[PDB]
Amino acid sequence: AVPGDMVRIPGGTFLQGSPERTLDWLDREGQAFPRDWFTDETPQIPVTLPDYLIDRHQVTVAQFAAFVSRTGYVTSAERAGGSMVYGEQYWEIREGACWHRPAGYGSGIRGRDDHPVVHISFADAEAYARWAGRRLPTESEWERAATGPSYRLWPWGDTWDSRNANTAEHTAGALGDLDAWRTWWGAIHAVQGPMPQTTPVGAFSPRGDSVDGCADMTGNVYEWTSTLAHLYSPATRCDPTIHLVMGRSRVIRGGSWMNFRYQVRCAERLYGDPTGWSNFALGFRCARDVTA
């Protein structure tokens, strides 16, 4: 039996990572990051997986609330008294920030039932998945579900469309140019506070869905995987801050509402501190062996 809220990814072998021509092309595009910020996607490696199950949607607020309701679970951020938000200029600790106070004391989740839940630490996410009789996806399971059985830049193919997902490409597009966006970012912080601009899970289906049926693998919230940060070959060379977290951080995928197109690709790698750190743009979805 396959649960109604999961989809079945068929087993096979796929090329995990990004080919050299993609990095060449990002080098040509006038985007910020030097090449060695993307080299942790290289070289591509053959990865064999069985059939496996992955959630169609990111875990929502309403689902996390049911978990807390029935178990009494207290999240890392609650224990710490705060959690990260992106402020006027930098990431910041926000007092009281947590899944039910996404912007800290004075905010709430009224009417965001079906949005992805955020301020989820690595341990929060594993606790939920365990309770649900499931687990986190590995990095390999996540990427295969995003790119499909052959390589593509985004879940829907190689041509960007700001309409297919919840990213900053939409919002900057609407305000007219990257400058009006930065102004806007500043202005909405003054009053409103640091509110996540999440969207209801599945709101862009089927446009932005992956080939196997996963929604929001692009943008909305970052997503935890169970994979400890590692290079695809021992000779891969990246920015020293990426090397620094290898073997310590867990892998975070998908990009978020805050990202532009190159940080929401199927193969983009990000990393997070698994020991209690969390932030207002990071959640998760679950996965399962076909047979538990």
Q: Give φ, ψ of 36 to 5 degrees.
A: -75, 5
* Residue 215 falls in which region: left (phi positive, over 0), alpha (psi -120 to 50) or beta: beta
Instruction: Report residue 170 as tokens.
Output: 């939409």
Nearest to 138 by CA among 58, 57, 251, 15: 251
Contact criterion met (CB below 8 Å) for 114 and 62: yes
User: Are residues 54 and 243 in contact, defined by beta-carbon separation less than 8 angstroms?
Assistant: no
Whole-angstrom distance, CA of residue 23 vs CA of residue 175: 29
Question: What is the enclosing helix (H) or strand (E) of 227?
Answer: strand 222-228
Place of tokens 């290079």: 231
Q: Which of 198, 200, 199, 218 is nearest to 208 (CA)?
A: 218
Distance CA 8, CA 212 (A): 7
Q: Where are the beta strands (DSSP E) in 134-193?
A: none
Residue numbers belonging to the annotated binding site for Ca(2+): 268-269
Tokens, residue 36: 């060695």
Give the integer Cα–Cα distance in Å for 193 and 104: 9
Query: What distance, in Å, lies between the first and last C-alpha atoms of the chain?
Result: 10
Q: How many CB atoms lie within 10 A of CB 110?
A: 6
Cβ atoms < 10 Å from Cβ of 267: 23
> Can you give the residue range of the structural domain that contains 105?
1-292
Q: Which pair of structure tokens corresponds to residue 22?
A: 């993609």
Between CA 64 and CA 230 the distance in angstroms is: 30
CB distance 20 to 42 below 8 Å = yes
How wide is the angle at C-alpha 135 spanned by C-alphas 143 and 208, nearest 5°?
Answer: 35
- What percent helix, strand, coil does the chain show, rounded to 5? 25, 20, 55
Return the closest-CA partner of residue 58 out of 160, 144, 164, 142.
142
Contacts of 105 by beta carbon, 8 Å cutoff, 6+ apart? 95, 96
Strand order in the sheet with 287-289: 6-9, 52-55, 287-289
125 touches 55 (CB < 8 A): no
Tokens of 272: 């997070």
Amino acid at 187: A
Domain count for the chain, please give it: 1
How was this structure obtained?
Answer: X-ray
Q: Which of 157, 156, 187, 159 is nearest to 171 (CA)?
A: 187
Closest CA relative to residue 250, chosen from 167, 144, 136: 136
Cα–Cα dist 75/251, whole Å: 20
CA 258-279-181 angle, to 5 degrees, is: 20
Do the Cβ atoms of 16 and 45 come closer than 8 Å? yes
C-alpha 237/C-alpha 119 separation (Å) is 31
Q: Pairing state of beta strands 82-86 and 91-95?
A: antiparallel
- The CA-based angle 180-256-41, given to 5 degrees, is 115
Indicate left, alpha or beta for 185 from its phi (over 0: left) and psi (-120 to 50: alpha).
alpha
Quoted resolution (Å): 2.1
Query: Which residues touch 17 (CB under 8 Å, ≥6 apart)?
Result: 41, 42, 43, 44, 45, 232, 267
For 277, the 3-state DSSP assignment is coil
Binding residues for Mg(2+), as ranges, are 40, 219, 221, 254-255, 268-269
User: Which residues carry a binding-site annotation?
Assistant: 40, 219, 221, 254-255, 268-269
With 0-12 CB in 10 A as exposed, 13-18 as middle and 19+ as buried, what is 209?
buried
